[PDB]
């Protein structure tokens, strides 16, 4: 009979993991402040890692990697790529990015302007995005000054692959699970969050793919695919009927390569191999695909949710390879292990 505590009530993924754990009859949930626990489904911000692994006789496990924010922060992910030799500043799958602190506060304002001036002079597309989209460096910098937090300016992919019919933009979400042993498992089930609006490269930020901006400011939500969510089975059949290529060949190889390159990069900094407690964590990778079928990394999410149709299978998988693998109970895996 294992024990676990829940410190993130707002977790739709681990609210199901907690629902499934109790269903095994071999897992008992304790108060959020009870230290005699095996598994901590911890909070997002300020998770007390320093208090784990110090209970005599208790093997303790937590659902977050201490230090993984270096990868799930706009400004840190940029700094991680420009300074980590494993990724190099010449990284071909990450958009040209820059760290820009507001003038009311190192900073890359001058380095960003040098490259911006080179595009305007070279007749090349010079459309950027700060991140709460413009081709003039003046508006971008003036928008960040009007805010009080750190911002990052990265190139805007002006040639995104459009689905037909519709001429519409989209993005791909992959869920990656790293266990206590640091095996990198890629959930076979992805989702494309498409825009129900025809992409327009001359203007309105609705045709350029969040589920909240499409279901609020877009007027064609649920027209083509239900909930603006296209799954791999359909998107693959489209790649074959349209481009005469598969999803595994044209996109999936590049995605598996990006996931590996990022996670293997930070392994020496976040690994719990020789630590007094164990860590696992579920990640959400967001990619973009251009008309050349080249995959780009948008960002990585450390507390991602799952598509409604996949909550059952993925959460069950989190229990199999991340929880039961450390606390066994008394296939055909749904994950694609990325060996290394």
């Amino acid at each position: 009979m294992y024990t676990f505590v829940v410190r993130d009530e707002n977790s739709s993924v681990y609210a199901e993991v907690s629902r499934l754990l109790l269903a095994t009859g071999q897992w008992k949930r304790l108060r959020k402040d009870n230290p005699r626990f095996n598994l901590m489904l911890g909070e997002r911000n300020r998770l007390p890692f320093g208090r784990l692994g110090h209970e005599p006789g208790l093997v303790q496990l937590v659902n977050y990697y201490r230090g993984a924010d270096k990868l799930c922060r706009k400004a840190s992910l940029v700094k991680l790529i420009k300074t980590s030799p494993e990724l190099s500043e010449s990284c071909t799958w990450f958009p040209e990015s820059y760290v820009i602190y507001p003038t009311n506060l190192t900073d890359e304002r001058e380095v960003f302007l040098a490259a911006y001036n080179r595009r305007r002079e070279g007749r090349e597309g010079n459309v950027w995005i700060a991140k709460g989209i413009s081709s003039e460096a003046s508006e971008l910098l003036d928008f960040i000054d009007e805010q009080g937090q750190v911002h990052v300016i990265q190139k805007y992919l002006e040639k995104p692959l459009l689905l037909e019919p519709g001429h519409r933009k989209f993005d791909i979400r992959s869920w990656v699970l790293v266990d206590h042993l640091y095996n990198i498992y890629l959930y076979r089930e992805g989702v494309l969050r498409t825009s129900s609006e025809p992409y327009n490269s001359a203007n309105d930020k609705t045709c350029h793919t969040n589920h909240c901006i499409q279901k609020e400011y877009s007027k064609n939500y649920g027209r083509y695919e239900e909930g603006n969510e296209m799954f791999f089975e359909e998107f693959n059949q489209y790649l074959m009927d349209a481009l005469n290529t598969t999803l595994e060949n044209s996109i999936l190889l590049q995605i598996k390569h990006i996931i590996r390159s990022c996670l293997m990069c930070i392994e020496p900094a976040i690994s719990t191999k020789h630590l007094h407690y164990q860590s696992f964590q579920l990640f959400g990778f967001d990619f973009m695909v251009d008309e050349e079928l080249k995959v780009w990394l948008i960002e990585v999410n450390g507390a991602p949710a799952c598509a409604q149709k996949l909550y059952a299978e993925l959460c069950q998988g989190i229990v199999d390879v991340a929880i039961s693998s450390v606390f066994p109970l008394a296939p055909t895996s749904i994950f694609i292990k990325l060996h290394h």
Binding site: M1, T3, L30, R31, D33, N34, P35, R36, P56, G57, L58
Partner: protein
């Protein structure tokens, strides 16, 4: 030389006290005449904790036997180990206390208290460094209850900084001498709440149910009930009477068991209770099982503030640690979460007579409040009709004194109830 002075008052007090010295005297190799005849130096290591050394290498218990009638102490002096007790240490009257708390505390007992304190003072003056006192008594009678608490009040006056512990036998209607036992117990609990540092509650109902249900004794007797108390008193004092990595006197043991001064009433437990070997897991499961506890309070009806576990015998201390953590980690909802690591374990390589290994449980649980709720209920059923009050008002007591003791015990209950939530 951390010496403990022992006191036993009244019928129940002296009968239980007698079996106590009988049990540990056999553990330290002391014969009925006070001569040592053991084989392990570990027996004499801490022998002076409870025994004074006399001429000829004799060991005389550091015990003071007190009663208001000669009956019970005559039996002790003629009992098995009767010759072991210092003859001067028998201080007894003749009128008796008629199961009347007032007689023991105010009239008969008051006439005799000083001569008892002269003997205490004699035993303390021979102590190189007095640890503290311990009293065995019942609360339902007159002497051990009324005069027993009178002594405690005077010992705290003359030795205000010494630890005062009691082994207090609580009355139960299922094992009752008189209908006034609730009156005497309530009046005594009032004293104990104020003037003792630690009280080991022994509920005669638990002792009977154990003899009847568990031990399968058709018609249990006080002799049978007193065997359980002997074993528990011997187990509770194991780590005071023998060496080990534990370097703790009474005060240090109290500091770690009593988070709040008034909540110092413990549930004692013993395991086992026949030729089969009992595994370390079995010792742990029983020790925490309510049936193996003497307070007659189901711990699952409360929360443990602190728990001390003393294992005796040669066993895997690695396995003991595993099992203790297992009981804790598998029942963490019965331990207050605002006292980290409030469950401690001690081991002892010397088991009790006839046992390859054994366990003694010492719990400070808020479930003890149910014992005071029983007494308070029985007290009120009579007190609301002032029934049997004349026995006490005839000795100079006033009802107000009763109402105050009642209110102090009810507060104690409400106090246990706030730390249980």
């Amino acid at each position: 030389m951390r010496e403990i002075v022992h006191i036993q008052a009244g019928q129940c007090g002296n009968q239980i006290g007698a079996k106590f010295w009988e049990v540990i005297s056999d553990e330290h190799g002391i014969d009925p005449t006070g001569s040592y005849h053991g084989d392990s130096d570990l027996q004499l290591e801490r022998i002076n904790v409870y025994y004074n050394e006399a001429t000829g290498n004799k060991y005389v218990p550091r015990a003071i036997l007190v009663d208001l009638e000669p009956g019970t102490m005559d039996s002790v002096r003629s009992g098995p180990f009767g010759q072991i007790f210092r003859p001067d240490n028998f201080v007894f009257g003749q009128s008796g206390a008629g199961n009347n708390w007032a007689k023991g505390h105010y009239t008969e007992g008051a006439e005799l208290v000083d001569s008892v304190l002269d003997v205490v003072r004699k035993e303390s003056e021979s102590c190189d460094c007095l640890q503290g006192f311990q009293l065995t008594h019942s609360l339902g009678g007159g002497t051990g209850s009324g005069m027993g608490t009178l002594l405690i009040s005077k010992i705290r006056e003359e030795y205000p900084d010494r630890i005062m512990n009691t082994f207090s036998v609580m009355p139960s209607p299922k094992v009752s001498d008189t209908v006034v036992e609730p009156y005497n117990a309530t009046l005594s609990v009032h004293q104990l709440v104020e003037n003792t540092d630690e009280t080991y509650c022994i509920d005669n109902e638990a002792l009977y149910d154990i003899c009847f249900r568990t031990l399968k004794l058709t018609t249990p007797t006080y002799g049978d009930l007193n065997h359980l108390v002997s074993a528990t008193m011997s187990g509770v004092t194991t780590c005071l009477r023998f060496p080990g990595q534990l370097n703790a006197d009474l005060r240090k043991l109290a500091v770690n068991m009593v988070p709040f001064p008034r909540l110092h009433f413990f549930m004692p437990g013993f395991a086992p209770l026949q030729y089969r070997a009992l595994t370390v897991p079995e010792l742990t499961q029983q020790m925490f099982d309510s049936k193996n506890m003497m307070a007659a309070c189901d711990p699952r009806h409360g929360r443990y503030l602190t728990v001390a576990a003393i294992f005796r015998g040669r066993m895997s201390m690695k396995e003991v640690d595993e099992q203790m953590l297992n009981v804790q980690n598998k029942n963490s909802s019965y331990f207050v979460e605002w006292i980290p690591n409030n469950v401690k374990t001690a081991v002892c390589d010397i088991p009790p007579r006839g046992l390859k290994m054994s366990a003694t449980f010492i719990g400070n649980s808020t479930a003890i409040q149910e014992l005071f709720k029983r007494i308070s209920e029985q007290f009120t059923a009579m007190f609301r009709r002032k029934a049997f009050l004349h026995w006490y008002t005839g000795e100079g007591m006033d009802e107000m004194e009763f109402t105050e003791a009642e209110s102090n015990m009810n507060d104690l209950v409400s106090e246990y109830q706030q730390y249980q939530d």
